[PDB]
Amino acid sequence: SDELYRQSLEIISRYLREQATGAKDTKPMGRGATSRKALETLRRVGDGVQRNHETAFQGMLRKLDIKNEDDVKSLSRVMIHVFSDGVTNWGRIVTLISFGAFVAKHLKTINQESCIEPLAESITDVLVRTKRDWLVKQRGWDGFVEFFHV
Numbered sequence: 172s173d174e175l176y177r178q179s180l181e182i183i184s185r186y187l188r189e190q191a192t193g194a195k196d197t198k199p200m201g202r203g204a205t206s207r208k209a210l211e212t213l214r215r216v217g218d219g220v221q222r223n224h225e226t227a228f229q230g231m232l233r234k235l236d237i238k239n240e241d242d243v244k245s246l247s248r249v250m251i252h253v254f255s256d257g258v259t260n261w262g263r264i265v266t267l268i269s270f271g272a273f274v275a276k277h278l279k280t281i282n283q284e285s286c287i288e289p290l291a292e293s294i295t296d297v298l299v300r301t302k303r304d305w306l307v308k309q310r311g312w313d314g315f316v317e318f319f320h321v
């Protein structure tokens with residue numbers, strides 16, 4: 172078991188799917204209150220990030236050339252490269268996930284909605300593998316919710 176991984180995947184995959192489809196998942200969370208609050212936080216902060224960084228996000232998306240599942244498997248390289256360099260903070264974590272939603276929207280437009288699942292899995296894996304101890308020290312998703320509160 173790996174609760175931090177499980178909860179992160181739940182939050183990130185739900186946010187990406189909802190951003191792509193425009194529809195909210197009514198299914199209960201795997202455990203719960205924290206995840207609901209995290210997802211609410213992402214809707215608010217993430218939508219702003221996508222608006223503020225439209226041009227940068229378009230540029231990154233073009234540089235990747237996601238067309239199929241094989242492209243999604245390789246974008247991990249770029250993601251790790253850009254995300255692991257420099258300092259760690261919640262703003263960069265929101266940027267990581269927000270760009271994920273941006274790509275997920277693109278995937279839906281090119282009829283590759285199934286690729287959203289490995290995309291979410293890849294984002295979660297990079298986040299939790301590279302930032303494990305920082306996330307734990309920052310109190311995980313409870314810390315995230317607190318950081319961006321009101």
Ligand SMILES: *N1=[C]C2=C([C]=[C]C(O[C]C3=NN([C])C([C])=C3C3=[C][C]=[C]C4=C3[N]C(C([O])=O)=C4[C][C][C]OC3=[C][C]=[C]C4=C3[C]=[C][C]=[C]4)=[C]2)[C]=[C]1
Pocket residue numbers: 224227228230231234235246249250251253254263266267268270271274294
């Ligand atoms: N091609 C393009 C780029 C390369 C390195 C850096 C770069 O910066 C573009 C940029 N500029 N601003 C102001 C922002 C914000 C960004 C940007 C765009 C997309 C993603 C991110 C950023 N900045 C950050 C950050 O500060 O950590 C990120 C998140 C980490 C990288 O996330 C990535 C990267 C690649 C694919 C995916 C991804 C996240 C989710 C899904 C896919 C432009 C080098 C070459």
